[model samples]
Target: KVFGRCELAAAMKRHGLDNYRGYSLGNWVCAAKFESNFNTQATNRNTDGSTDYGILQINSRWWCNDGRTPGSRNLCNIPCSALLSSDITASVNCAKKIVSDGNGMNAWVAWRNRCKGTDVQAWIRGCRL
Candidate 1:
């Protein structure tokens, strides 16, 4: 809902999710696409009884609060709803923490499954960075 423009350039303006922690922009873009289609408000209830939050689909069990339900480790020290907000400053910071936890971009299952070893350069095609 922040930029509301899925275009890579607009997304860049909102938050430079790419190249943080030495990861590529394509890694973030491809993960965001397959995970939430670039929708900030997107969340998913997993079969394992956990939930994903925000444009990055970070899991509630580890990265953020599950909001009303609680019980999240809240490792990001932030509400899951905050991750869903258009203002990505906090979430982006949390994302770096997630990456630094040693998984790198592989922390996002989408990044591993969809972006790894692929020709992800096209993820930034028309954006002009």
Candidate 2:
């Protein structure tokens, strides 16, 4: 599912992404936009053969087990396929873990390069939420 800007923001809020680790809801919305363009089924294969999964692009290297990435710790303890689902629960939960691991939102390069230290409020401008 590809979500509209405001639609994605509302969903992220429902998952408690609002101000998680001092990153505002717009921050997450912006990251997701750059990361996957709000597509729930997005996946990006990394240069090292690790694959990023779902809207947040949770990685296979240290987050989920895809039975493909070597030495995967599966810290989220979920199948990487779970992150591809439209439900997004697995992705959201794993994303929280990614931040809690002391990376904050810096775990996503797109977030750092695009959303970080920028006006993320633009990501949610004119949204009713």
Best by TM-score: 2
Cα-based TM-score, every candidate: 0.84, 0.96
- In model 2, residue pairs whose N, Cα or C atoms come closer than 3 Å (at least 3 residues apart or on different chains), thus clashing, are none
* Candidate 2 steric clashes: 0
- For model 1, how many clashes? 0
State how far residue 102 of model 1 sits from its true place (Å): 0.9
Per-residue error (Å), model 1, residue 107:
1.1
User: Where in model 1 is the C-alpha error above 4 Å?
Assistant: 2-16, 67-71
lDDT of 1 by residue, 23-97 (tens): 777777777788788888888998777788888898888887765444658888987888888767776878878
Number of clashes recorded per candidate: 0, 0
lDDT by residue (11-108, candidate 2, tens digit) is 88898888988889889999999999999899999999999999999899999999999887799999999988878778888898899988799999
lDDT scores of the candidates, listed in order: 0.76, 0.91
